[PDB]
Structure formats: structure tokens, C-alpha cells
């Protein structure tokens, strides 16, 4: 009753890079609570360290996919990129438009999750892994 979203096998990767999405989990957790709660401060300053690391994180992705010539480094970049576009309107919605912006937000977020940091990340694992990164 009290989480949005929860880790799960499907989600595990490699080590270095479960230390990341277990933090990206946490913050979409606590961004919902905070829209529960509900109380636009945290929610602000949730969201903005969640974008800073949602950044930092697709920064060490990329770095991994740019070592090791990773064939799909150009599509999953792209759509890295795309997604902090997203991550900015979010963030000029959120503030403070309206209370309900945090609601699409974690919609966004959670679509995200499931779709980018569960199945599209899951494609570079077997590739990286082969070639020693952990």
C-alpha cells in the first residue's frame, strides 16, 4: 500500500548497474509518496534529484555502450535523450502547474521503468557481461 513500484528479477542486470535502477526505483517511490502525501516541495525536490540522476545514470550506460561498441549505442542513446527532453517539460509542468502534473508524471515514470530500465536495458546485458563488465 505504501509503493509504486517494486524491484524484481526481470529487473536485475549487472551489479553496477542495479546499484543505479534500484536508486531510480526509490525516487519514483518517492515521488509518489510525496503525491500522496501530498506536498509539492518534496515532490519538487524529489523530481530534481531524480532527473539529475536519471542523467548521471544514462551518462554511465553510455560510456559502457561507447567502450565497448555496444551495436545498439546510437538507438539507445537517442532514446535516453528523448526521455530527459520528457523529463524537462515534466519538470516546467510540474512547477507548479497543477497538482495532477505529478500524477501523468509517475504514469511517465512507471512506463519507463517498465518498458526502458527493465526491457530495453535488459538487451545490453549478455553483450557487456560477455566482455568482462559487471
Same mark, same amino acid.
Not at 545514470?57 to 555502450?65: A, D, P, Q, V
Not at 512506463?111 to 527493465?118: A, C, I
Given at each position: 500500500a505504501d509503493v509504486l513500484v517494486k524491484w524484481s528479477e526481470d529487473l536485475a542486470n549487472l551489479p553496477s548497474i542495479d546499484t543505479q535502477h534500484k536508486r531510480l526505483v526509490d525516487y519514483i517511490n518517492d515521488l509518489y509518496r510525496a503525491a500522496r502525501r501530498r506536498d509539492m516541495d518534496k515532490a519538487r525536490e524529489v523530481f530534481d534529484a531524480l532527473k539529475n540522476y536519471a542523467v548521471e545514470h544514462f551518462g554511465y550506460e553510455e560510456r559502457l555502450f561507447a567502450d565497448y561498441a555496444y551495436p545498439e549505442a546510437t538507438r539507445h542513446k537517442e532514446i535516453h535523450r528523448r526521455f530527459v527532453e520528457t523529463v524537462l517539460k515534466w519538470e516546467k509542468q510540474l #512547477? #507548479?502547474?497543477?497538482?495532477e502534473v505529478v500524477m501523468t508524471t509517475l504514469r511517465g515514470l512507471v512506463d519507463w521503468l517498465v518498458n526502458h530500465e527493465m526491457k530495453e536495458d535488459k538487451k545490453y546485458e549478455a553483450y557487456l557481461r560477455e566482455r568482462g563488465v559487471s
Amino acid at each position: 500500500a505504501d509503493v509504486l513500484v517494486k524491484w524484481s528479477e526481470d529487473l536485475a542486470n549487472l551489479p553496477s548497474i542495479d546499484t543505479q535502477h534500484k536508486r531510480l526505483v526509490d525516487y519514483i517511490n518517492d515521488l509518489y509518496r510525496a503525491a500522496r502525501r501530498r506536498d509539492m516541495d518534496k515532490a519538487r525536490e524529489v523530481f530534481d534529484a531524480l532527473k539529475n540522476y536519471a542523467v548521471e545514470h544514462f551518462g554511465y550506460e553510455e560510456r559502457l555502450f561507447a567502450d565497448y561498441a555496444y551495436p545498439e549505442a546510437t538507438r539507445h542513446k537517442e532514446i535516453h535523450r528523448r526521455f530527459v527532453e520528457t523529463v524537462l517539460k515534466w519538470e516546467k509542468q510540474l #512547477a #507548479a502547474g497543477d497538482p495532477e502534473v505529478v500524477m501523468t508524471t509517475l504514469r511517465g515514470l512507471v512506463d519507463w521503468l517498465v518498458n526502458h530500465e527493465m526491457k530495453e536495458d535488459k538487451k545490453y546485458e549478455a553483450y557487456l557481461r560477455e566482455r568482462g563488465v559487471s
